mmCIF file of C-alpha atoms in Angstrom:
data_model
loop_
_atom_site.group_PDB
_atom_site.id
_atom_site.type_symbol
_atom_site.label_atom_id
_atom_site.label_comp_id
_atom_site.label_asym_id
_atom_site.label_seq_id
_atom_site.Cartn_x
_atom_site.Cartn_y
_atom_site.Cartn_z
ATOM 1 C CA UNK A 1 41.862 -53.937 31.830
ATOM 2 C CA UNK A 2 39.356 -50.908 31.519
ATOM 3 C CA UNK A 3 36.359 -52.250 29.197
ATOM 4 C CA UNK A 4 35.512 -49.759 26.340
ATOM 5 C CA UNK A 5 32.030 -49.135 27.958
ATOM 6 C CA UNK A 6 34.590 -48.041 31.331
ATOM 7 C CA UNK A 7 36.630 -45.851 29.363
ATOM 8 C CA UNK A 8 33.418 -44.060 28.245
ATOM 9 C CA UNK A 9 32.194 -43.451 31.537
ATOM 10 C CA UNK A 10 35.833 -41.411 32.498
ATOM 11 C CA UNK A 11 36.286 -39.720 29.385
ATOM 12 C CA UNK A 12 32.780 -38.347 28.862
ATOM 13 C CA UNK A 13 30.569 -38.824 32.250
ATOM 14 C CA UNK A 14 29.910 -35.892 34.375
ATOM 15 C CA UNK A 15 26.689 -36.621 36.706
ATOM 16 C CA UNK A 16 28.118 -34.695 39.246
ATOM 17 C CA UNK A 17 27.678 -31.514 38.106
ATOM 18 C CA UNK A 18 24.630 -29.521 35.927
ATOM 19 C CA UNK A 19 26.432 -27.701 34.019
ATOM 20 C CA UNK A 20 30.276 -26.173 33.155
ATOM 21 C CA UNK A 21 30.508 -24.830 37.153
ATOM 22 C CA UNK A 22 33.692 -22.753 36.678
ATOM 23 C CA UNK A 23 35.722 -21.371 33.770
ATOM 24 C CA UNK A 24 39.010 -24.220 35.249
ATOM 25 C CA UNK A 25 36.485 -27.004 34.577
ATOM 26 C CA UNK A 26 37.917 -28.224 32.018
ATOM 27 C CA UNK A 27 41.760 -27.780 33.266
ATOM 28 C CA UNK A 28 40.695 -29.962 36.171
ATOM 29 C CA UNK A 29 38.329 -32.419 34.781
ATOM 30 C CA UNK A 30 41.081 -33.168 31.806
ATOM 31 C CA UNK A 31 43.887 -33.908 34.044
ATOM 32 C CA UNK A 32 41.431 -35.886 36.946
ATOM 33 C CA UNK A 33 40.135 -38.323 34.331
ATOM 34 C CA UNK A 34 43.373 -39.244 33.187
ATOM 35 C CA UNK A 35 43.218 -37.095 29.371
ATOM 36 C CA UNK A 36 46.549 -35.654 30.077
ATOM 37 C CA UNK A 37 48.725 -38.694 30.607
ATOM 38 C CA UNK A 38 50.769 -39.233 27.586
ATOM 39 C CA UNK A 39 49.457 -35.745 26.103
ATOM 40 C CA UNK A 40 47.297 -33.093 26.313
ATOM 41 C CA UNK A 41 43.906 -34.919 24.773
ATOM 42 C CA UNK A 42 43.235 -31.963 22.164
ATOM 43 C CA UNK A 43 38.954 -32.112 22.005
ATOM 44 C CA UNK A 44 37.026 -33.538 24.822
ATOM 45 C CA UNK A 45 33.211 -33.572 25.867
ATOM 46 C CA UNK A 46 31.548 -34.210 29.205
ATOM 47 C CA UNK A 47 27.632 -34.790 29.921
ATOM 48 C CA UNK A 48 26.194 -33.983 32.596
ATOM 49 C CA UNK A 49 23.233 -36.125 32.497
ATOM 50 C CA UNK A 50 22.328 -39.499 34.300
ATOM 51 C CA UNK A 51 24.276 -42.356 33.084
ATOM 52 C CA UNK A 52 20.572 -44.098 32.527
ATOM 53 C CA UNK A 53 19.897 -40.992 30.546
ATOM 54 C CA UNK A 54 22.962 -41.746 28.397
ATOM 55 C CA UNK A 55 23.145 -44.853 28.187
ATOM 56 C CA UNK A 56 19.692 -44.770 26.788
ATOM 57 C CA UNK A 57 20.407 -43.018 23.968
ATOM 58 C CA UNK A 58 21.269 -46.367 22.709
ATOM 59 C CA UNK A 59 17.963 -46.737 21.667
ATOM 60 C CA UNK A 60 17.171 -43.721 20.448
ATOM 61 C CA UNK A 61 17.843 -41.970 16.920
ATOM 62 C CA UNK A 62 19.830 -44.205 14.642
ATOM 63 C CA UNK A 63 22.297 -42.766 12.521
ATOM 64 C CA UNK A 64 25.844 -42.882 10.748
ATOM 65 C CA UNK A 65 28.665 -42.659 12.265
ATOM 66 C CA UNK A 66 31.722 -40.249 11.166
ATOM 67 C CA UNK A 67 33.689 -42.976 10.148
ATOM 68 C CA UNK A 68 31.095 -44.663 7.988
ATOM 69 C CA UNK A 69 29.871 -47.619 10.741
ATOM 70 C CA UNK A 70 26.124 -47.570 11.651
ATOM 71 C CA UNK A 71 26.203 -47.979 14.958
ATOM 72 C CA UNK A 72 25.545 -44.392 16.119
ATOM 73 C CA UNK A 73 22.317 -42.762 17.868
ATOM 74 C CA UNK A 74 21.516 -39.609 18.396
ATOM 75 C CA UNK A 75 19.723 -38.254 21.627
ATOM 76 C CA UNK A 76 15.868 -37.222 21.139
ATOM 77 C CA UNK A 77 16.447 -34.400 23.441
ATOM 78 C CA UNK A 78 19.237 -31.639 24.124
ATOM 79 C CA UNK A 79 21.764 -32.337 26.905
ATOM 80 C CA UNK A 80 23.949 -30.104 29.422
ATOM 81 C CA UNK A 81 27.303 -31.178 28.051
ATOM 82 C CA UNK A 82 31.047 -29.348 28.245
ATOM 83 C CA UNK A 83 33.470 -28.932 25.308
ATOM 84 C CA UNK A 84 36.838 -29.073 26.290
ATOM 85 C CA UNK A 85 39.473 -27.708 24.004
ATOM 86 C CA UNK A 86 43.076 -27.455 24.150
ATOM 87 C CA UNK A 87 44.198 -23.626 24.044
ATOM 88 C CA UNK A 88 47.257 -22.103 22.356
ATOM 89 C CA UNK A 89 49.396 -21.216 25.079
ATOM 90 C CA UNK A 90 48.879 -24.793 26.328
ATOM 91 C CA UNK A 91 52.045 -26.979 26.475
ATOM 92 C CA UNK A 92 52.211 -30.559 28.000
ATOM 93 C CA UNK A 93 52.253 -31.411 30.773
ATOM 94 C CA UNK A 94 50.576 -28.238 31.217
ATOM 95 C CA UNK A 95 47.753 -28.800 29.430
ATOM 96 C CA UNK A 96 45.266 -26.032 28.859
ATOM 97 C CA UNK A 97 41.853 -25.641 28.378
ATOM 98 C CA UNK A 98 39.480 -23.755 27.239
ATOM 99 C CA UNK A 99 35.694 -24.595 29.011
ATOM 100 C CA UNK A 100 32.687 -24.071 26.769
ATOM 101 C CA UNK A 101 28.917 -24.866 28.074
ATOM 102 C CA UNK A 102 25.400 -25.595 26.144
ATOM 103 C CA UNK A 103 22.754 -27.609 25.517
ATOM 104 C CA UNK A 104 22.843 -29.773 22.657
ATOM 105 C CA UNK A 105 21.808 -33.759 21.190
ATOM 106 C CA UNK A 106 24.750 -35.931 21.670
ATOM 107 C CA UNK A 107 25.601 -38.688 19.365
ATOM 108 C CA UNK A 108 27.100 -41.987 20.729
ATOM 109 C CA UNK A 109 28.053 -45.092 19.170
ATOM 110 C CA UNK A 110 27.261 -48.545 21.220
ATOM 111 C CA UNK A 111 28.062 -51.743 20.965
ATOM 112 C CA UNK A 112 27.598 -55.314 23.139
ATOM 113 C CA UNK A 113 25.406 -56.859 25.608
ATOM 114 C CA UNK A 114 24.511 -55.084 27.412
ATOM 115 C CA UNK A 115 24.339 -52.334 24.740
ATOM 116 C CA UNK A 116 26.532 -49.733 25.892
ATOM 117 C CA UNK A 117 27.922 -46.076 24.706
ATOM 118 C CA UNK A 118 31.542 -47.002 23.934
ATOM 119 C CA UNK A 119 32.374 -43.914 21.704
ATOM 120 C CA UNK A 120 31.374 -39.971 22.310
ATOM 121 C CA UNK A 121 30.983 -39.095 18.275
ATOM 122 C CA UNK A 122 29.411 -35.960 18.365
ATOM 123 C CA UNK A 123 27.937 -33.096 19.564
ATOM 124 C CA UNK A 124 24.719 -31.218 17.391
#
């Protein structure tokens, strides 16, 4: 019964590699993590940063979240992450993708104890 801190971890944690490696990434990555089962997930991000490194964003920059909770914290520092979005020609199950890399602050929300990133909320 995947915890919401679990389901973080597959939908938006890629230590493995620095940066977006090829231009099928995101075609692979999408479909491996399970963000192609019942459809073809439209927006995803991936960082590739320790999960220490994420998960201490926790403490970091407070801030609002984009539905109105306050639970949200922004990273201090830029982070190798990988936008993943669903192309035009792309029709499930063949989902396509289209793999975009950079360096930007990430904003999570957490929750519980331990306090965790449950939710990827943005990218700035």
């Amino acid at each position: 019964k995947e915890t919401a801190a679990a389901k973080f971890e597959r939908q938006h944690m890629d230590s493995s590699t620095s940066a977006a490696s090829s231009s099928n990434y995101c075609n692979q990555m999408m479909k491996s993590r399970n963000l192609t089962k019942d459809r073809c997930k439209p927006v995803n991000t991936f960082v590739h940063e320790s999960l220490a490194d994420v998960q201490a964003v926790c403490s970091q920059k407070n801030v609002a979240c984009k539905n109105g909770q306050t639970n949200c914290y922004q990273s201090y520092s830029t982070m190798s992450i990988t936008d993943c979005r669903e192309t035009g020609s792309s029709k499930y199950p063949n989902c396509a993708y289209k793999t975009t890399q950079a360096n930007k602050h990430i904003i999570v929300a957490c929750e519980g104890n331990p306090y965790v990133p449950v939710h990827f909320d943005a990218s700035v």
